[PDB]
Amino acid sequence: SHRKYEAPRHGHLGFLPRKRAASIRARVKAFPKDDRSKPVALTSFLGYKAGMTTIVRDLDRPGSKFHKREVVEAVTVVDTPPVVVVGVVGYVETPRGLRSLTTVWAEHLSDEVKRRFYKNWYKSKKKAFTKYSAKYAQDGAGIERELARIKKYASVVRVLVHTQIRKTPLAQKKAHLAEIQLNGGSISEKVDWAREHFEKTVAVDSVFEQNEMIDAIAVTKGHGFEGVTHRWGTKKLPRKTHRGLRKVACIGAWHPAHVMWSVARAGQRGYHSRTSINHKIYRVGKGDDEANGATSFDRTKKTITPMGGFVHYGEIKNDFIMVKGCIPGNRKRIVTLRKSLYTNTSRKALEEVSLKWIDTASKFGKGRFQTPAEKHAFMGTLKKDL
Amino acid sequence: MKVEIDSFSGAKIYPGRGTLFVRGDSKIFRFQNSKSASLFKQRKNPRRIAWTVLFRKHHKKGITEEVA
Amino acid sequence: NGAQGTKFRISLGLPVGAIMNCADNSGARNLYIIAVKGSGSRLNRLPAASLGDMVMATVKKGKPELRKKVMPAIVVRQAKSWRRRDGVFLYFEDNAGVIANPKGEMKGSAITGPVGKECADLWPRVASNSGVVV
RNA sequence: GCAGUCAAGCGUUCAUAGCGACAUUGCUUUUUGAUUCUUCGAUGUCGGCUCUUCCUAUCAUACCGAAGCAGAAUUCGGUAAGCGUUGGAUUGUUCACCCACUAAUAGGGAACGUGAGCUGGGUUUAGACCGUCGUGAGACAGGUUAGUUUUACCCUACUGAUGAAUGUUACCGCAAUAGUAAUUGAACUUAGUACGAGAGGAACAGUUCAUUCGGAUAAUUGGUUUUUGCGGCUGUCUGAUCAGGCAUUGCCGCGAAGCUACCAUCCGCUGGAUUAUGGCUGAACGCCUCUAAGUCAGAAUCCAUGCUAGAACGCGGUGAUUU
RNA sequence: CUCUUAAGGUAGCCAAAUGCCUCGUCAUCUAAUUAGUGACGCGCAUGAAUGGAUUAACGAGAUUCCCACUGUCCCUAUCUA
RNA sequence: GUGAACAGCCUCUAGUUGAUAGAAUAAUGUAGAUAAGGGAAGUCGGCAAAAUAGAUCCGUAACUUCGGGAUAAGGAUUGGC
């Protein structure tokens, strides 16, 4: 009767059931609506969250006290090694949705996807697509037949992309595989983009640009079984309470004479698949630049990687986004950078960047330097020397 | 920008990477980290702290630069 | 009311029950916060003030003709480490405020101490009455 | 407790803008009663704390009508419970009054929700005191003070986690169904403009910010420290030295990694049908009429988009399928 | 002056562990106090060894305020066995 | 031995090493700790915890049964050679 002081619900009912996701790789539960007046391009890309660092830049938001002034914002890095296409896929339209028809593949599929489709590589015979692959020994009859059947049907089409994981310093010899839906017009152009890209790689450099908005789809960090307060921020009970205080007191009333779903019980915090949106890109670079840490304003030769290396990862020697701020999942985790489902009219999506400076310093310490050059310039001759 | 210097060590201070401390009158101090901040609060003496700029500049240690 | 603009978020450090030093020449020595002007509500959440926030407070140490009544006030210094977008984390050594009317005019004629930029930029009279700033 | 009806009269004039007497019809069960059907081989009987949900007879937020509405502010009313509905002083309190912020500080239900969840301040065991009553024992919805709060391992429910059987095994997917979450204010400009005799004093559009809520994240800042990582210090033992042990982690400074904070940071969508309401055409009724047909817009509404799970007996596709 | 019946509350003391009406009325403390303290008193029903009034020291007694102090709390977090 | 000291802490003599054990290291607990800024707003109630704490020196009110209050309060110092 009449909770004395009305206060608001703890936690979000929509993001239930806070259970473990079916896999580390997060599905894409919807895709950008197609504009059949463009070339075919992917609607997403795959990469690995790698960490963060501290970029500095200037603002261009009139209205601000910090207009035209420097700001120390936060950026997360995604290693986006170019991902290779090894299949396409059909989807016909039904009163039950986009039902599949074929999943067609290339020929010389790597050991990586062959590994994905096993669990015990070294003592298996490594025999996955042997016969579908020998079917290329002909002119490619059924290959092109189903290509044609998909040209006919397949109200939707998806290229199948596997990552070039052997690049990144990870010790996972297996490459994550997934679909990416195509949103040009011209179904012929769709499939032929696919086909010309069979066994070919693609990079974000062809899909994303500066000052553009993406969305991040991944799995939450794993925190195990965890209790009610921290899962829902529920108020800790006092010190005087018999039998624990990291609890909830009234888990329900007498009538309805059960316990409702609406109630904060202990359980699993983490390994949830989450979809964060409207994250603006700040820089899209490659492996060659020795001096990404050198910018328009910085010339000191130093790339994006900070001293000593990223923590828990190893070093970026491949393509990369630095995108704004917080992006679900922890380091080493697969991530999908999808692009949006609508236009920003924020002025904030569109306040572009002129980057100025980066910390390239050891996040494994309190780095006070940027280069070993600077390091020696600052201290100098060591009792070790020459 | 201006790479500030640590008021206790003179080590160099990029943006975000530390703190400012307004003394109660107006005297500013910049700190790279909670380390130098805690030393400052403990009221410790850099000219005796064996390892900062203001230590060796006092001590004529390894400058080897003023006679060039 | 009467503010010269808006306010960017700032780490909160002066809850209710707090006592800060008065940094004007009104004739006070302490300022005891009891409310805050914005102070959006919540269950068992104490109203908090921060640099440049107007509050209501009272005197515990000062004049007999000054204590024992409520008066609006304004914060000028705050030992609660906060952040400016330029990455400098900064904090004063103390916590300090001033007395005022609903419009943002002090009862004072000067200050004894440094001041916060946000309070200065948002409260022009306080800036005027300020000497050194930060 | 709340609502209606008729209309004497107030409301300068004027029954009905707002009110509303004499009367009268009702509703509810958030008051107290009346009854004693259940239960006295036992339902743990005050309040608060914490937590979820629900209702509308809506306090505010959204959209509208009306005015004794010029503007502002306000009052009456309609859709509407989607989102909110405070910090405190005294009190055991519910209640109550005050302070103050507020957009607002609405009423309530759930065995007068909530004691195998707490507390136990009060009430209500025995102890003790006072006053009055009583010859007296002792009494007193009279006052005061001290006074053990038991058990879940069972079923269910819930929250999370596995799982046989579907020819096997692996990979990519669909999406029935269920849930759903965003809210609120201020400043600048608007504009000192409209409006007004002036006093005063708006709104829309648009920009920047913020509160409440939520979901993630650790670059920075901060907090944490058995990295027992570096150093120092005390006491004592190892003959001294170095290097070491014990002091239930010996203490102190620092302290990465990791975990976490509105103590940090990032982010939090747009499309359709509708309410009231206002209108089109338009008779019924040869005029009129937003309606009877039909139709337009329109809300924090509903439903979609999107977001979460993925039916363990819903489904598809694809690959390998035993010297 | 007188009735009750024998006398008619003296000194002191109070909304007190005793005061219904009651959160008594005044002041003070306080932003705000049914708390506390100091005063008032036709006191339902104070009170003189059924002891009254007071009182230094002492009190694991009850109560109020103040300073320091703080995870009690705003608001949680983290570590160890 | 430290130290005022049979306190507490370590140790020689003597005696024990006996209280089911192994692997992990989730919530929740029990016990022990630390915490920004503020500082009882929490709470019936500052319950619990934190602060102080030895020794030397200075300084030490009200009230008083002149004995006390008093370690009052309140300040400074302390290491080793």
Taking the C-alpha atoms of residue A321 and residue A337, their distance in angstroms, rounded to an integer, is: 10
According to CATH, the topology of domain A16-81+203-220+270-384 is: Elongation Factor Tu (Ef-tu); domain 3 (2.40.30)
Say whether A190 sits in a helix, a strand or coil. Answer: helix
Q: What is the Cα A201 distance to its own chain's centre? A: 18
Q: Resolution in A for the shown PDB structure?
A: 3.3
Burial of B8 (0-12, 13-18, 19+ CB in 10 A): buried
Mutate which: A366, A374, A379, vs B, most B CBs within 10 A: A366
Is C77 touching B (CB cutoff 8 A)?
yes
Cα separation, A259 vs A248, whole angstroms: 13
Q: How far is CA A229 from CA A17, A233, A379, C20, C65, in A?
A: 17, 5, 49, 33, 49
* Strands (E) located in chain C: 14-15, 19-22, 31-36, 48-49, 54-58, 71-77, 82-83, 89-92, 96-99
Order of all β-strands in the sheet with B19-22 = B28-31, B19-22, C89-92, C82-83
3-state secondary structure of A44: strand
Taking alpha carbons only, the member of A251, A324, A250 closest to residue A284 is A324
Q: For A268-304, b where at least 16 C-beta lie within 10 A, e where not — what string? A: bbbbbbebeeebbbbbbbeeeeeebbbbeebeeebbb
How far out from the chain centre does Cα C52 lie?
A: 6
How many other CB atoms are there within 10 angstroms of residue A131's CB atom? 8
This entry's atomic model was obtained through cryo-EM
Give domain limits for chain A: 16-81+203-220+270-384, 82-202
Contact C23, C43 (CB under 8 A): no
CB C114 within 8 A of CB C134: yes
* Contact (CB, 8 A) for C16 and C55: no
Say yes or no: Cβ of A236 under 7 A from any atom of strand E. yes
Taking residue C122's Cβ as centre, other Cβ atoms within 10 Å add up to: 23
* Pair C13, C50: CB distance under 8 Å: yes
Three-class DSSP labels, C39-55: CCCCCCCCCEECCCCEE
Q: Which fold has domain C13-134?
A: Ribosomal Protein L14 (2.40.150)
Q: Are A109 and A163 in contact (CB under 8 A)?
A: no
Closest CA to A356 of C83, C88, B12, B15: B15
Asked if residue A356 lies in contact with residue A295, where contact means CB atoms within 8 angstroms, the answer is yes
Give dist(CA A160, CA A104) in Å, integer: 9
Domain A82-202: give its CATH code: 3.30.1430.10
Q: Do A295 and A284 form a contact (C-beta atoms < 8 A)?
A: no
Q: So where are chain C's domains? A: 13-134
Bases of strand D lying below 7 A from some protein CB: 48-53, 83-88, 95, 99-105, 107-120, 149-150, 157-162, 170-176, 179-181, 186-188, 207-223, 253-271, 305-310, 314-321
**Tokens describing residue A294:** 């050198």
Does residue B43 belong to the interface with chain C, where contact is any CB pair within 8 Å? Answer: no
Q: Measuring CA to CA, how many Å separate C13 from each of C19, C33, C82?
A: 11, 12, 9
